[PDB]
mmCIF file of C-alpha atoms and ligand atoms in Angstrom:
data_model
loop_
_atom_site.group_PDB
_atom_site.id
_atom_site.type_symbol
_atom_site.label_atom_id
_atom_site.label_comp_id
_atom_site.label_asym_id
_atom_site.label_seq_id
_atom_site.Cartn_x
_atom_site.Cartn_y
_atom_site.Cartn_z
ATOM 1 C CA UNK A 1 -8.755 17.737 -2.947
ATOM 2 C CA UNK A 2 -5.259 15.816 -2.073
ATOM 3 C CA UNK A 3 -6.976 14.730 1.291
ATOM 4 C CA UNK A 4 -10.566 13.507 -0.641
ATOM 5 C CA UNK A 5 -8.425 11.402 -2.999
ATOM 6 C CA UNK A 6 -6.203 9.508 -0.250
ATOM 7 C CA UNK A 7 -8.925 8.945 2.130
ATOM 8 C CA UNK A 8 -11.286 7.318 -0.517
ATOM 9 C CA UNK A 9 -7.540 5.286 -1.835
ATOM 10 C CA UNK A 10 -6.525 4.478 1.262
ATOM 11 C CA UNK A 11 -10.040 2.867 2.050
ATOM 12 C CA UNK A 12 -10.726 1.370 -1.474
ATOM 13 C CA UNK A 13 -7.454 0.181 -2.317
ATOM 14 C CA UNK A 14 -6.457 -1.468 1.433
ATOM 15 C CA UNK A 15 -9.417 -1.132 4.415
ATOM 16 C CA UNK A 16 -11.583 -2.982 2.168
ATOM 17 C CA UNK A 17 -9.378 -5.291 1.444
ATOM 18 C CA UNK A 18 -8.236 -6.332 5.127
ATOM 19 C CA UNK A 19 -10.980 -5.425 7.127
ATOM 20 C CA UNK A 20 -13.674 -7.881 6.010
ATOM 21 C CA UNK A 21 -10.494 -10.535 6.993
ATOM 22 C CA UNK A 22 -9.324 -8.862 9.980
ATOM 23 C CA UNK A 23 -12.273 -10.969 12.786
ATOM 24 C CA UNK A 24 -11.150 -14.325 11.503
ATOM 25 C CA UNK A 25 -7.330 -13.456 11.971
ATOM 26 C CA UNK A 26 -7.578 -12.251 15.150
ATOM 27 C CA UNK A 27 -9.573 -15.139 16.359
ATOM 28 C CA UNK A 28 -7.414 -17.757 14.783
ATOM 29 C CA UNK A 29 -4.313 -15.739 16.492
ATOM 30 C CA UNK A 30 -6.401 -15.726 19.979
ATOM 31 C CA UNK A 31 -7.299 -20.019 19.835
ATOM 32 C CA UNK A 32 -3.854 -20.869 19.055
ATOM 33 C CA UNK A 33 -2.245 -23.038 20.964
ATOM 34 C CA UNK A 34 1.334 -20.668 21.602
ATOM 35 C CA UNK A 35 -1.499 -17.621 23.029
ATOM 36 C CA UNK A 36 -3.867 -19.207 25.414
ATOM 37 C CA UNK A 37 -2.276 -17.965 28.439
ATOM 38 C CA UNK A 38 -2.114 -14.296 27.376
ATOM 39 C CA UNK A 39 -4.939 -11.792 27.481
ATOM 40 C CA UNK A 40 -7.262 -12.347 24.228
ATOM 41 C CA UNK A 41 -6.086 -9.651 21.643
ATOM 42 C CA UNK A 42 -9.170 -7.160 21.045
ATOM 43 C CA UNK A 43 -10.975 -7.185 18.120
ATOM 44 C CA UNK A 44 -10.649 -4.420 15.661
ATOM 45 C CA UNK A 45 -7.808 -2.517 13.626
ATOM 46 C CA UNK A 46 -6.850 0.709 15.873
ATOM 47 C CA UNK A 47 -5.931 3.515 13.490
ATOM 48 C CA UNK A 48 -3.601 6.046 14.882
ATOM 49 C CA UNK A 49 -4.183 9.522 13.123
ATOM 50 C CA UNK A 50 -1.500 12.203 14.336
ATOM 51 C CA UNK A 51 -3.257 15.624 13.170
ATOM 52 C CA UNK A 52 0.622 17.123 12.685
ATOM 53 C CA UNK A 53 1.201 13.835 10.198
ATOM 54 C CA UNK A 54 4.218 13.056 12.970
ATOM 55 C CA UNK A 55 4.508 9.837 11.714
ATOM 56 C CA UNK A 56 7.247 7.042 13.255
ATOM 57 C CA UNK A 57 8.082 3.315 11.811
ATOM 58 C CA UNK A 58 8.463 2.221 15.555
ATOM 59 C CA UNK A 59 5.630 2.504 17.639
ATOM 60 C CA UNK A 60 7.580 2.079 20.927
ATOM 61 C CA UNK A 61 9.563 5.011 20.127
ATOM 62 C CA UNK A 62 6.723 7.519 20.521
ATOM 63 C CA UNK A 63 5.863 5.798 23.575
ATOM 64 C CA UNK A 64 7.811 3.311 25.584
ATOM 65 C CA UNK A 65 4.076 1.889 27.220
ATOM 66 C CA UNK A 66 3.560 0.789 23.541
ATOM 67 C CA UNK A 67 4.905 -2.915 23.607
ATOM 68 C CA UNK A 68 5.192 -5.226 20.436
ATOM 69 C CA UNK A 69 3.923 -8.578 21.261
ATOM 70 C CA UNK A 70 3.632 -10.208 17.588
ATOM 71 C CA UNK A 71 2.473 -10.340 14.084
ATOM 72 C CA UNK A 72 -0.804 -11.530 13.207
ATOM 73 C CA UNK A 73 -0.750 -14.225 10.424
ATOM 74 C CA UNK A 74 -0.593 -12.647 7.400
ATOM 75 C CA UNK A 75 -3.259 -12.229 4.743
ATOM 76 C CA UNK A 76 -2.409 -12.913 0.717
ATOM 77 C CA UNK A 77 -4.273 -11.752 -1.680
ATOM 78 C CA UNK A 78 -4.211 -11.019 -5.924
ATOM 79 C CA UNK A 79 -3.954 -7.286 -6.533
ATOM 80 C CA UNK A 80 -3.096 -5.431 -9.608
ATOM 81 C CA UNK A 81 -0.653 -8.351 -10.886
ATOM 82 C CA UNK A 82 1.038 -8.356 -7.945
ATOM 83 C CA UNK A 83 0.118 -12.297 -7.021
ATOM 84 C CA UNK A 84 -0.463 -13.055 -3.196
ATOM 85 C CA UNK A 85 0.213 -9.286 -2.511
ATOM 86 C CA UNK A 86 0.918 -9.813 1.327
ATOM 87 C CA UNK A 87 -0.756 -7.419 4.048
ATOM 88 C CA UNK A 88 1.105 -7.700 7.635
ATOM 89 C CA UNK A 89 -0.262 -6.246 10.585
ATOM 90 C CA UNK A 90 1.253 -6.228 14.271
ATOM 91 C CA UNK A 91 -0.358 -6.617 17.453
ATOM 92 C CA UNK A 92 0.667 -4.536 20.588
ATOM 93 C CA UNK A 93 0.455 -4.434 24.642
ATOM 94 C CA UNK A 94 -0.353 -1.367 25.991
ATOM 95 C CA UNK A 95 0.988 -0.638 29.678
ATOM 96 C CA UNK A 96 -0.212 1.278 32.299
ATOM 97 C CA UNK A 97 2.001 1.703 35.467
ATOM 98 C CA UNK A 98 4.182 -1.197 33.825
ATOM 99 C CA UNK A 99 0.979 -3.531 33.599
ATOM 100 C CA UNK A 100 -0.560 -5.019 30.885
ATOM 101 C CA UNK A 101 -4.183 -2.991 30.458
ATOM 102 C CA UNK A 102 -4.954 -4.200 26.996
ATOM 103 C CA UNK A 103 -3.578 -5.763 23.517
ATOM 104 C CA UNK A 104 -4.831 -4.683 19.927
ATOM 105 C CA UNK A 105 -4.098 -4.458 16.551
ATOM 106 C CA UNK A 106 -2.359 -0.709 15.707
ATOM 107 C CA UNK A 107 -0.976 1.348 12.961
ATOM 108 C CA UNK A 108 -0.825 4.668 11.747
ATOM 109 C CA UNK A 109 -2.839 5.911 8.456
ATOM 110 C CA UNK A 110 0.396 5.537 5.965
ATOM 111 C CA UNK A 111 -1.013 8.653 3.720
ATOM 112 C CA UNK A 112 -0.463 11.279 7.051
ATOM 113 C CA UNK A 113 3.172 10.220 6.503
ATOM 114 C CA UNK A 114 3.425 10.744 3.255
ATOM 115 C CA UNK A 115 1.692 14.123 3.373
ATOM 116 C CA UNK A 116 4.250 15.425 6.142
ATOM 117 C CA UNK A 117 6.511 14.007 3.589
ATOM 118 C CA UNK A 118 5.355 15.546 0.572
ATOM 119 C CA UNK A 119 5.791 19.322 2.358
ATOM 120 C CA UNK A 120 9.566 18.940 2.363
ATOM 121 C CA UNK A 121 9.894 18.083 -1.346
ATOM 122 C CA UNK A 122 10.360 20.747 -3.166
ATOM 123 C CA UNK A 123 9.049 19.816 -6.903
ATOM 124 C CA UNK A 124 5.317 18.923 -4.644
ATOM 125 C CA UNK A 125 4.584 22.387 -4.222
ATOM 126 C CA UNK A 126 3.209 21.625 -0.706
ATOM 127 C CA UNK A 127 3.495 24.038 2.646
ATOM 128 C CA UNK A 128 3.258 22.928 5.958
ATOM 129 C CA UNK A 129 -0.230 24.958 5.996
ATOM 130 C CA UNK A 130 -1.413 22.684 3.187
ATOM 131 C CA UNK A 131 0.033 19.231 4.869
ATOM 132 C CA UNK A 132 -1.793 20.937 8.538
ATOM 133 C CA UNK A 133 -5.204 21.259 6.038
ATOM 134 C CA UNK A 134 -5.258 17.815 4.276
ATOM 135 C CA UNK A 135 -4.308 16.181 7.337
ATOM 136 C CA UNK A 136 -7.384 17.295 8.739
ATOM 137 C CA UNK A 137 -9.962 16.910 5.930
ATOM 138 C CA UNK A 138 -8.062 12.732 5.653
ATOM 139 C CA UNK A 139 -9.263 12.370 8.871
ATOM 140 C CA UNK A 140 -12.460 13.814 7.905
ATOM 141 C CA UNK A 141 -13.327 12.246 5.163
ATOM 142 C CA UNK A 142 -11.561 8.601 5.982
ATOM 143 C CA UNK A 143 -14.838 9.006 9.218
ATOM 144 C CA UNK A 144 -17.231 10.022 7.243
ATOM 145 C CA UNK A 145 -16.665 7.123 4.566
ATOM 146 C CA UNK A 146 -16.283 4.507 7.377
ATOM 147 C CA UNK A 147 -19.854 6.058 9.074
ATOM 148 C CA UNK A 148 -21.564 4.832 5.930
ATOM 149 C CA UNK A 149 -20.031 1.513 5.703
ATOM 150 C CA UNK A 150 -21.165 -0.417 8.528
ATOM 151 C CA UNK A 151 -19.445 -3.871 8.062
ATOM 152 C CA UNK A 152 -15.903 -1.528 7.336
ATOM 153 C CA UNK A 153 -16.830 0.405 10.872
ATOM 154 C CA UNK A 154 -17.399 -2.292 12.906
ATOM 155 C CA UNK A 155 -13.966 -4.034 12.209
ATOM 156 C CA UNK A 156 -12.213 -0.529 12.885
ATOM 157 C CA UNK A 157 -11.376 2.282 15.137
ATOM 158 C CA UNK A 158 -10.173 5.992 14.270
ATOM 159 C CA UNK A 159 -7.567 7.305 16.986
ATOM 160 C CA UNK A 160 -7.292 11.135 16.390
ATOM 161 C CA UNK A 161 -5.239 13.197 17.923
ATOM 162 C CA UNK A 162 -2.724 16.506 18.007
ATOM 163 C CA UNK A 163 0.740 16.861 19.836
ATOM 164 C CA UNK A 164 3.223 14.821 28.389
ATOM 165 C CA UNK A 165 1.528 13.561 25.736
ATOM 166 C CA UNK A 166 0.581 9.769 26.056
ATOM 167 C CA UNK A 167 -0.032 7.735 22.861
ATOM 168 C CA UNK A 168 -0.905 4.485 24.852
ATOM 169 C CA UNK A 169 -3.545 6.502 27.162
ATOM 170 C CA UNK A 170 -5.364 7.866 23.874
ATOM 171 C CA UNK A 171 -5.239 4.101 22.769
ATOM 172 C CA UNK A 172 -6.678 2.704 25.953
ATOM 173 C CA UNK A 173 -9.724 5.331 26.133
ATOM 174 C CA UNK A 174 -10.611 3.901 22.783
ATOM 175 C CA UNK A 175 -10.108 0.063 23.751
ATOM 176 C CA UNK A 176 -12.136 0.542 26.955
ATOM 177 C CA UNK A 177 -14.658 2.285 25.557
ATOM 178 C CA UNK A 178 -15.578 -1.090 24.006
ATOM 179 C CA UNK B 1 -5.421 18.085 -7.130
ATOM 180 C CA UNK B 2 -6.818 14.656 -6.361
ATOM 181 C CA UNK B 3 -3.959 12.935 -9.095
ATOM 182 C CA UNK B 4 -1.077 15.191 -7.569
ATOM 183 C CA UNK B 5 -1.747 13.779 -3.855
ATOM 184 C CA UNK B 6 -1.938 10.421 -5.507
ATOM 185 C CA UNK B 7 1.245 10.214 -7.252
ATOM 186 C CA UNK B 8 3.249 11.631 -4.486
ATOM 187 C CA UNK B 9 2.378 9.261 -1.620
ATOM 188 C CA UNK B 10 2.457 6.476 -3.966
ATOM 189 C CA UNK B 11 5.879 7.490 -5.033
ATOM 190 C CA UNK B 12 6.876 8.438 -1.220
ATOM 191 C CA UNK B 13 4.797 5.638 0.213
ATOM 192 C CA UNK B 14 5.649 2.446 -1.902
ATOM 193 C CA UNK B 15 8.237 3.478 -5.366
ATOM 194 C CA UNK B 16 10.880 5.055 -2.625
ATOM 195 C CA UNK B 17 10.499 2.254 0.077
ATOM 196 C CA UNK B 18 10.737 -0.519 -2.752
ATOM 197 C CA UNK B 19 13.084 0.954 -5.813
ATOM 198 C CA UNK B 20 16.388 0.776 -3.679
ATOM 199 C CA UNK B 21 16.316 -2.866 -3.383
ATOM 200 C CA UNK B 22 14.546 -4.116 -6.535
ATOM 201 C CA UNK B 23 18.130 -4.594 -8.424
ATOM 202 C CA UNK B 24 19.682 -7.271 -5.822
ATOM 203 C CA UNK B 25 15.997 -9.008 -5.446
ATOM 204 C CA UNK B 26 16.707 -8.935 -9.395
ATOM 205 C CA UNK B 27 20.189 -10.183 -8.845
ATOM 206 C CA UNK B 28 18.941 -12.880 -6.300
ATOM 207 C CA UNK B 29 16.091 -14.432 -8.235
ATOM 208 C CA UNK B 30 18.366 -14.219 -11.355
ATOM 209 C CA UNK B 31 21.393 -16.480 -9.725
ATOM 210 C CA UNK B 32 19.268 -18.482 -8.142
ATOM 211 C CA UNK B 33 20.389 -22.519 -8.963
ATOM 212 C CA UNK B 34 16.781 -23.301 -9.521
ATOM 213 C CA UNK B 35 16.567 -20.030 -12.411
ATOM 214 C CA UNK B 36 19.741 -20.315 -14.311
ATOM 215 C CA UNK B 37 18.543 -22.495 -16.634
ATOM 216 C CA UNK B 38 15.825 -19.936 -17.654
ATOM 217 C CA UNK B 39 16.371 -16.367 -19.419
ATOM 218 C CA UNK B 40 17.651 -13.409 -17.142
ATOM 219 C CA UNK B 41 14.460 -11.401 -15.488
ATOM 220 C CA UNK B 42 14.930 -8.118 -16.936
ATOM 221 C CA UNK B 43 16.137 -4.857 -14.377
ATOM 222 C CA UNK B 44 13.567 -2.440 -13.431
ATOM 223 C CA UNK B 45 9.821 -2.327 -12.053
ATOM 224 C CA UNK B 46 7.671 -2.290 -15.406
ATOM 225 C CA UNK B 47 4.593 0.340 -13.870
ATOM 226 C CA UNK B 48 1.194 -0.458 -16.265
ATOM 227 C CA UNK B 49 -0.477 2.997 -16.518
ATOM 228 C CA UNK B 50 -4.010 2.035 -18.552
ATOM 229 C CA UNK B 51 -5.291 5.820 -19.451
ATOM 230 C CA UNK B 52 -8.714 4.315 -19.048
ATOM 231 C CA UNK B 53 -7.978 2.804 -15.303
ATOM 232 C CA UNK B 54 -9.409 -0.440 -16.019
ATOM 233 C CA UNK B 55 -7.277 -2.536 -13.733
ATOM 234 C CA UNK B 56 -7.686 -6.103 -12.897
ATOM 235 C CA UNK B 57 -6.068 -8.201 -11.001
ATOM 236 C CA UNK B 58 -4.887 -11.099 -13.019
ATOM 237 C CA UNK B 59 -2.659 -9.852 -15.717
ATOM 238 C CA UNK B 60 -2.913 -13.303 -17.774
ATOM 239 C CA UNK B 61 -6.670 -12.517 -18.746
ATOM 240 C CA UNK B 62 -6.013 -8.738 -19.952
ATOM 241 C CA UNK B 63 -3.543 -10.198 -22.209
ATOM 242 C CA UNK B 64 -2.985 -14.219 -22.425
ATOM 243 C CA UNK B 65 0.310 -13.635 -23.829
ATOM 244 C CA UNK B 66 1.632 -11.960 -20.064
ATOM 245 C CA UNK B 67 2.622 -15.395 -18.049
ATOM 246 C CA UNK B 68 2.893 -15.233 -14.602
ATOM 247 C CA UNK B 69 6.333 -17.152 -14.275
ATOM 248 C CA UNK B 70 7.348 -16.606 -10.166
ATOM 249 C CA UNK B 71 7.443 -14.281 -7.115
ATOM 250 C CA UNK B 72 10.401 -12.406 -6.716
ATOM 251 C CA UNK B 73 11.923 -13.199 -3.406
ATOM 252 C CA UNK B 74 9.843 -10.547 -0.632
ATOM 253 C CA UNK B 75 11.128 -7.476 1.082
ATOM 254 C CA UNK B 76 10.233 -6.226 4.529
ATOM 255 C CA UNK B 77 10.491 -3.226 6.088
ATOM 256 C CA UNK B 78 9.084 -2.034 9.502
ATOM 257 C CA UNK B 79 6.410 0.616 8.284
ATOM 258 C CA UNK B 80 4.638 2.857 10.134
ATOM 259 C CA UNK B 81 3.710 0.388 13.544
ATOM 260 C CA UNK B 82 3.418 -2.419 10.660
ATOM 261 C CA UNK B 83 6.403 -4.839 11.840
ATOM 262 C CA UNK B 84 7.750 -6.317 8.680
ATOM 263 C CA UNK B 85 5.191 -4.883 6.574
ATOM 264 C CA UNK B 86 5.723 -7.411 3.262
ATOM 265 C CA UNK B 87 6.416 -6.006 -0.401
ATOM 266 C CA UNK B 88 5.908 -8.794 -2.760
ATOM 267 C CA UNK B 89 6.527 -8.342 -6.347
ATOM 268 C CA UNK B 90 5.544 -10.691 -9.502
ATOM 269 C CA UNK B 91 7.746 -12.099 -12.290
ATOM 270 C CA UNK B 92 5.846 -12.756 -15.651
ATOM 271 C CA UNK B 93 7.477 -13.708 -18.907
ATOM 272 C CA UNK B 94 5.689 -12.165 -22.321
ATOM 273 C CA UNK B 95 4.793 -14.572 -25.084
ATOM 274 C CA UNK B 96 5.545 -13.369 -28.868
ATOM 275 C CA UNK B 97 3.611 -16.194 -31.174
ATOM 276 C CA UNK B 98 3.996 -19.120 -28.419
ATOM 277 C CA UNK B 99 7.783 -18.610 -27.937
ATOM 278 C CA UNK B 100 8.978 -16.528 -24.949
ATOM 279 C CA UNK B 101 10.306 -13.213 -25.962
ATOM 280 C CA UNK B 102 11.117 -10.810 -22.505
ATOM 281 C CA UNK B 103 10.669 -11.692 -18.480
ATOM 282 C CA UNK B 104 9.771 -8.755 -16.232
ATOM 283 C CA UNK B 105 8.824 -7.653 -13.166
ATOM 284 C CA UNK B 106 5.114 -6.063 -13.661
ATOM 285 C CA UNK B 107 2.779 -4.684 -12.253
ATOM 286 C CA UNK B 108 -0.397 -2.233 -12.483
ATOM 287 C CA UNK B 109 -0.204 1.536 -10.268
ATOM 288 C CA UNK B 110 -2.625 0.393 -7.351
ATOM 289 C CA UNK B 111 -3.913 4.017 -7.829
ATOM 290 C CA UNK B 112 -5.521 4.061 -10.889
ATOM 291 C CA UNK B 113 -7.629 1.034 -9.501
ATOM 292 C CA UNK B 114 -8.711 3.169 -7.061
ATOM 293 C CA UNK B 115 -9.487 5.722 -9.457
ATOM 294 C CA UNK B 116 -11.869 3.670 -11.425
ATOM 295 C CA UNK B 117 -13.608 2.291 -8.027
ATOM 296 C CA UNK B 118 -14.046 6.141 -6.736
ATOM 297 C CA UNK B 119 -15.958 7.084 -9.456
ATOM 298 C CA UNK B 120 -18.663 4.447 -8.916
ATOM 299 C CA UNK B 121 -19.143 5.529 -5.544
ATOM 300 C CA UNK B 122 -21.997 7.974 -4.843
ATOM 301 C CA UNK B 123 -20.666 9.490 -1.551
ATOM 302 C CA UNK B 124 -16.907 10.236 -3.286
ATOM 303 C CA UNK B 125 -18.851 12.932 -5.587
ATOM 304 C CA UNK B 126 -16.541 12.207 -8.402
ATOM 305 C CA UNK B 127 -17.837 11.593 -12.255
ATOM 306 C CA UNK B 128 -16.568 9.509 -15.047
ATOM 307 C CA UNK B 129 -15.070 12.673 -16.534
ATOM 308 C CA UNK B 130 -13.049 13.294 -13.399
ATOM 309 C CA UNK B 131 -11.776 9.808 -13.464
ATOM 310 C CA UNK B 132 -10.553 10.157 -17.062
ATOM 311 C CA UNK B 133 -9.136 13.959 -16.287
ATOM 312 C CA UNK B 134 -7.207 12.740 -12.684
ATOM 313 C CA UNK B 135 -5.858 9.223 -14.235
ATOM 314 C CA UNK B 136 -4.215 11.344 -17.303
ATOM 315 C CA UNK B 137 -2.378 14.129 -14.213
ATOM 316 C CA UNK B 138 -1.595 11.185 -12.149
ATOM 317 C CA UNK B 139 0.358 9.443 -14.858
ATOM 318 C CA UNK B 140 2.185 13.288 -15.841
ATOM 319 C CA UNK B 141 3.002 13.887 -12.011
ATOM 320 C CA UNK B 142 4.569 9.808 -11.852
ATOM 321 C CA UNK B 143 6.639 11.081 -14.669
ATOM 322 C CA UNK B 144 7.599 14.303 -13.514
ATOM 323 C CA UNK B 145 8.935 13.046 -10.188
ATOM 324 C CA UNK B 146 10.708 9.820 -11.751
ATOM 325 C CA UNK B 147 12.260 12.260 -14.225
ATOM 326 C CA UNK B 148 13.603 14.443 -10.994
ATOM 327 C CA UNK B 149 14.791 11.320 -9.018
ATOM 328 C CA UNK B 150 17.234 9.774 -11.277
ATOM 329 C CA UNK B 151 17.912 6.559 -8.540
ATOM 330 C CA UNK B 152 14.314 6.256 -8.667
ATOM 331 C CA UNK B 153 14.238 6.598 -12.145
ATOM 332 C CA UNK B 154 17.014 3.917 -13.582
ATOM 333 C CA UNK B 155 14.896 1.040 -11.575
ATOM 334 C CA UNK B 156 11.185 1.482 -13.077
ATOM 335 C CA UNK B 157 9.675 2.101 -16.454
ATOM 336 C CA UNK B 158 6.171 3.467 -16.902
ATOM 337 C CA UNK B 159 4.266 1.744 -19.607
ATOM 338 C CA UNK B 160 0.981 4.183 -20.444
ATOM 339 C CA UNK B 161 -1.324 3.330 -23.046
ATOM 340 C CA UNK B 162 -4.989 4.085 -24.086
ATOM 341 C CA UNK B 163 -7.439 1.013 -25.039
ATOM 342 C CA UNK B 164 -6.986 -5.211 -31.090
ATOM 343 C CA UNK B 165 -4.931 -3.830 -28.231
ATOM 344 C CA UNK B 166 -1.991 -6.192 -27.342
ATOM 345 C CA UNK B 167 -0.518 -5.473 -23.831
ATOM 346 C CA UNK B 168 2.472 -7.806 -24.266
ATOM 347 C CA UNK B 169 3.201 -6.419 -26.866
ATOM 348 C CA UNK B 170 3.110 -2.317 -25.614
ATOM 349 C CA UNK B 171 5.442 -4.514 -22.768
ATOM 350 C CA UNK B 172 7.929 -6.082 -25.366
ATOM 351 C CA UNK B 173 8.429 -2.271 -27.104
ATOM 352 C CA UNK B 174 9.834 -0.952 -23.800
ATOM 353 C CA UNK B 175 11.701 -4.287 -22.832
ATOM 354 C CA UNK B 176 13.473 -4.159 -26.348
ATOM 355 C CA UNK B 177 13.920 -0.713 -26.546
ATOM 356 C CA UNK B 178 16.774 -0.857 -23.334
HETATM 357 C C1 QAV C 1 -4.050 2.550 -4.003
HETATM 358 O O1 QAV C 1 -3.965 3.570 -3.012
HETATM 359 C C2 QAV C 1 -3.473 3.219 -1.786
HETATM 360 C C3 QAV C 1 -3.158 1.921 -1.431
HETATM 361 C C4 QAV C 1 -2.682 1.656 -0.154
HETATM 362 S S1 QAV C 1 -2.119 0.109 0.407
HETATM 363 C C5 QAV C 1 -1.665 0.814 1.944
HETATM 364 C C6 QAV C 1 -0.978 -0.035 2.919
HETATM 365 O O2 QAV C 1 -0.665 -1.195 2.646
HETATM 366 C C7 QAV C 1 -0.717 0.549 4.281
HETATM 367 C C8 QAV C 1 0.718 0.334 4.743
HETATM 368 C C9 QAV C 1 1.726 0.925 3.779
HETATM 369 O O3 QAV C 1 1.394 1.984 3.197
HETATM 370 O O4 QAV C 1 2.812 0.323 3.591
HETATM 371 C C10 QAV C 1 -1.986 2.141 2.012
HETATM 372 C C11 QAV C 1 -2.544 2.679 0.799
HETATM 373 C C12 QAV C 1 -2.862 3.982 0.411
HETATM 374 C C13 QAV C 1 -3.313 4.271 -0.877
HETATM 375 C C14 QAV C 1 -3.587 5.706 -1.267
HETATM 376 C C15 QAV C 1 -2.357 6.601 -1.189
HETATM 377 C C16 QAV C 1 -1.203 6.251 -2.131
HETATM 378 C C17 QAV C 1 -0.407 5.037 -1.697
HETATM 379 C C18 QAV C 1 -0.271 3.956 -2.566
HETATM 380 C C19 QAV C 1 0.377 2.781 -2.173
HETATM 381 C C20 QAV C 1 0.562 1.523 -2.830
HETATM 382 C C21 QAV C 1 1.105 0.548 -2.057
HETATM 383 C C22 QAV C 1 1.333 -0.862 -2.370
HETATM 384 O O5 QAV C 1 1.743 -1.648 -1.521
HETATM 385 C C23 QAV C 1 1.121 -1.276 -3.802
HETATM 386 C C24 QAV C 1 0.195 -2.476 -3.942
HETATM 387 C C25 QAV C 1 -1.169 -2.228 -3.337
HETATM 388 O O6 QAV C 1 -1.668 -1.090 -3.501
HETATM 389 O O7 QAV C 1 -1.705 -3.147 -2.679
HETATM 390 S S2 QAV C 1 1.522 1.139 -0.456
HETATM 391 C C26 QAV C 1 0.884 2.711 -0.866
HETATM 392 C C27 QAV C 1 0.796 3.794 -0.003
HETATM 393 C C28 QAV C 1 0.162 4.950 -0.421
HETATM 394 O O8 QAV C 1 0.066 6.078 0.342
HETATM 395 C C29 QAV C 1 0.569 6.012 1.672
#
């Protein structure tokens, strides 16, 4: 299926490649000198899964308790020719009554945006019942590969969801149950 | 199908975030006082499509005639909660009998990696045969979209080729032929 073939991608081709690296990032962003007098930034990478593939570029913009604080440093790597292919990540506050009640590491799934994508293009041949479907069985499948790959699922987090709605409350469930 | 997923979010997800601004990276590398004593990097992304997915990640020892010669200069983009998510590109100048005889930007579809790396997977179900049949559709639906998007189109080339072989050379045909 489209879903079965982005899910195992999407894993294969970047999870595996930043999560075994994500621990020693964070921890060389929480000892350095400029971040000592902040809260320590959770370990982790929080991955936001919309199940109606709504998927923003700004993070504060689908919820104003969703702060940006800072990048983490970035990792480099050799892939495909592409020398020190660069993987950035960004690190956010999450506010609660206009309090700081926890920082992480967050992004949404990039393939849920390009399947609500792919259902307005024409030449794709995709409905909205099909993007709905796949969105669903990513999700799925993106668990169920994670489950069986223990040192992948410990340096990660799956944030499902459908569409007040508060994005930084679904966030903060996750990052307390820690 | 597995290859028709692929192609789309890797045209909607990286070709259509990065094509618009390849030409005036181009332009900028090109005028560059520390490059105008060299030969002018050639226009367009140069996309390596091996039929067989074998990908690796150092293009020098699939062929030792493909010389990696500089980075482009990066572009950022704020990408789904990723704050200046990096997109760093490769410059590599193609050897004909010792003497230089084409620079281009080049690189391998990250897909077709991932591809290859499925099929050795026992929980992704998917065969050998598979790999072969969904390479060969995602390679046809690349095409078919790039043909359709004629923006898209003038600022990539898609080198396919079945695998003695001599990748700088399949290279060279397409670089000479504009
Ligand atoms: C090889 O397959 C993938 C690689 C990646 S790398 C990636 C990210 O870096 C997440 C952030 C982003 O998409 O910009 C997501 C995916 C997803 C996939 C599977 C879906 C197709 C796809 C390809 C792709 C290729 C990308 C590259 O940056 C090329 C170099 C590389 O793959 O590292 S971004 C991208 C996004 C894609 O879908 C959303």
């Amino acid at each position: 299926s489209v879903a079965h073939g982005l899910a195992w991608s999407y894993y294969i081709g970047y999870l595996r490649l930043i999560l075994p690296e994500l621990q020693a990032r964070i921890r060389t962003y929480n000892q350095h000198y400029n971040n000592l007098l902040r809260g320590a930034v959770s370990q982790r990478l929080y991955i936001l899964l919309p199940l109606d593939c709504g998927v923003p570029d700004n993070l504060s913009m689908a919820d104003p308790n969703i702060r940006f604080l800072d990048k983490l440093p970035q990792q480099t790597a050799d892939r495909a020719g592409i020398k020190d292919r660069v993987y950035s990540n960004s690190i956010y506050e999450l506010l609660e009554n206009g309090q700081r009640a926890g920082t992480c590491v967050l992004e949404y799934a990039t393939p849920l945006q390009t399947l609500f994508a792919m259902s307005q293009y024409s030449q794709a041949g995709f409905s909205r019942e099909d993007r709905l479907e796949q969105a669903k069985l990513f999700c799925q499948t993106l668990e169920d590969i994670l489950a069986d790959a223990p040192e992948s699922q410990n340096n990660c987090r799956l944030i499902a969801y459908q569409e007040s709605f508060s994005l930084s409350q679904e966030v903060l469930r996750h990052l307390r149950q820690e």
